[PDB]
Design a protein around this ligand. Sequence first.
Ligand code: HEM
Ligand SMILES: O=C(O)c1ccc(C2CCCCC2)cc1
Ligand SMILES: [Cl-]
Length: 393
Amino acid sequence: TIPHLAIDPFSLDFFDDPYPDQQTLRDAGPVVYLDKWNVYGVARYAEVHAVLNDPTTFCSSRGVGLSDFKKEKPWRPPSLILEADPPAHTRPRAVLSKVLSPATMKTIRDGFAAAADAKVDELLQRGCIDAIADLAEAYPLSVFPDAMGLKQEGREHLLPYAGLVFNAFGPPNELRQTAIERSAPHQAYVNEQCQRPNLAPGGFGACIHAFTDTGEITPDEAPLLVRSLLSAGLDTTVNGIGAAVYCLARFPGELQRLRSDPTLARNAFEEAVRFESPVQTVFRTTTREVELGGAVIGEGEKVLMFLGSANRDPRRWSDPDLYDITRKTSGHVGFGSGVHMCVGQLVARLEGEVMLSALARKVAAIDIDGPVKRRFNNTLRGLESLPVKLTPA
Ligand code: HEM
Ligand SMILES: O=C(O)c1ccc(C2CCCCC2)cc1
Ligand SMILES: [Cl-]
């Protein structure tokens, strides 16, 4: 009843061009079985949305990667938020929500915007830049570590640790094994920066530790919740902003619309998240036998959600393969959906908005002028190098 496919969604060929195989996954049926890894897959918007919004049946405490924490040891102690279910999930989630609150955004927005304008001004002086290293990476590295309260020394561990975290969600292929092989120095740095004395006053890290006396979290929970932000808070925005610049570089018509109305910056970034879906995949584990799309999935089965495919499903979207900065993007699953929906999305959207605003006001053209190189990761989709010439407005 359930179609079996040999597609490996974690193969380099798949990463290089996932869209044909993602259509094959969608059109094979609402639920597929991936013989390569012995997991169920759902690639249509409807089933992805349904799974995300049934956390009781499709739990996260057994891991949101391929590995089932009930069968294998997690590569690191489980996250108190991402890898927890209600009710254990609820209070750690509330703390991170209050830490990354609208009030916090108001306190940091002006500095985030000034740094975005400064970076674009700097880049325009060079003209020919690499939109990854020099922008998508450089800008978040210029605001997020400081907003965390991190010291200067050791920040070079942040992106490697994030690449490790996101490769570790995948199956035990070479990408994952190599990441874990090299993990020790990055884990050691990150774990140490999670301790309260190492997080500067007023930043996100210190705010988490200050929240340890309300009865929501205890002091021994704060370090791992800092770990959550050092895991998820940087590499995601790098690939989000990279996605948006890549979109504007490829669709000059949309850059021209953005220039004509910079208030479209926030939705242009939201559309980029839908269009590229920097986070491609997430797993759940069934806690019971469950019917999904006519298939009977047993208990303790891994279910792979194709967020990027759901965000290009023509059953949900009109012209899903077009980048449209005035599209009504509400409902895309690029940030997830339901109780685990990205708790840091206000930070993500703030960075993306102020960067696209800087580009909208200061840049007239973005032309690819060198070889584009893709970056391969079991969970993240993005580029390694994006040579562009920036023409000033
Ligand atoms: C474009 C940027 C980002 C994208 C595309 C993204 C994507 C996602 C997605 C899809 C989830 C759901 C995971 C699941 O359902 O299992 C998630 C959760 C999460 N994200 Fe984001 N994220 C981004 C930025 C950020 C930032 C900036 C932070 C922190 C500053 C952050 C922290 C988290 C955390 C802690 C969770 C777990 C929330 C929970 O389990 O309740 N993310 N993210
Ligand atoms: O350590 C954590 O708590 C943690 C780590 C990684 C993530 C990812 C964010 C982007 C979507 C996939 C999951 C979320 C939380
Ligand atoms: Cl770790």
